[PDB]
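Dataset card, provenance and construction

Sequences and ligand SMILES were collected as paired inputs. For each pair, a complete structure of the chain with the small molecule in place was predicted and serialized as structure tokens. The example below shows a pair involving chloride ion. Curators did not alter the output after generation; any descriptive sentences attached to a record were derived from the structure itself.
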Amino acid sequence: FQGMKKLNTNKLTEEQVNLFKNNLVYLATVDADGNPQVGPKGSMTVLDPSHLQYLEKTKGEAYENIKRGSKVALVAADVPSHTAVRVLATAEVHEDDDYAKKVLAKTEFPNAFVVNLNIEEVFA
Amino acid sequence: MKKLNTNKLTEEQVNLFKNNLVYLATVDADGNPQVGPKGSMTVLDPSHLQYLEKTKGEAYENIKRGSKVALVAADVPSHTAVRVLATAEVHEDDDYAKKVLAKTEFPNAFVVNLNIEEVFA
Ligand SMILES: [Cl-]
């Protein structure tokens, strides 16, 4: 995998959208001491080239960091090609509002939280 | 995943690092997070890991400015995973780096040693 550079856009290309769609995404947040945290998120989807969404089922450290104001970094990597894309995003969390209810009605996790991610920057 | 109150990997956690793709995360000096895969990650002992920095990209720049380093080794199908928080020591072309890289095709990479501060699972 190559070093990534800032692409000076907040819009994914189609190839990058397909990276996010087709691979297990990893997400990183920042804890209360300013340290990183990282873990996999299987429920990631792409709403449009500047917005992603996932379900927060565990409500663990990532969620607590986000609730405390952390920004979110995401990566989607394709090992066979060694291609990857990363984003920096701000999180918009929907716990039990009508938007959450609408989104979750299409899933089997009615008590999850719906986290939308507004892409600020793309790196590749 | 919860703090285990140790800086030492268990045998199961060593195997998780050995058998799965590891992801690394850092923060820039303003606190914005970064995350990416690290295929060269290796456990040296229960409290130390090591990887190669071949590209010297954003994780590198963040570490240079003092970022601590988070790692995860997840076997997602098996529902097992381990996370660490560590500090880095960067070896660019000292005798240690040379010794390590002699066993690789990457003689100009930097060697980054990670000292585990906390394990989570
Ligand atoms: Cl495109």
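Derived descriptions for this record:
Residues 1-121 of chain B form a domain with the Pnp Oxidase; Chain A fold (CATH 2.30.110.10).
Chain B touches chain A at residues 1, 21, 23-27, 31-37, 39, 55-58, 60, 67-72, 74, 76, 81, 83, 85, 120 (CB under 8 Å).
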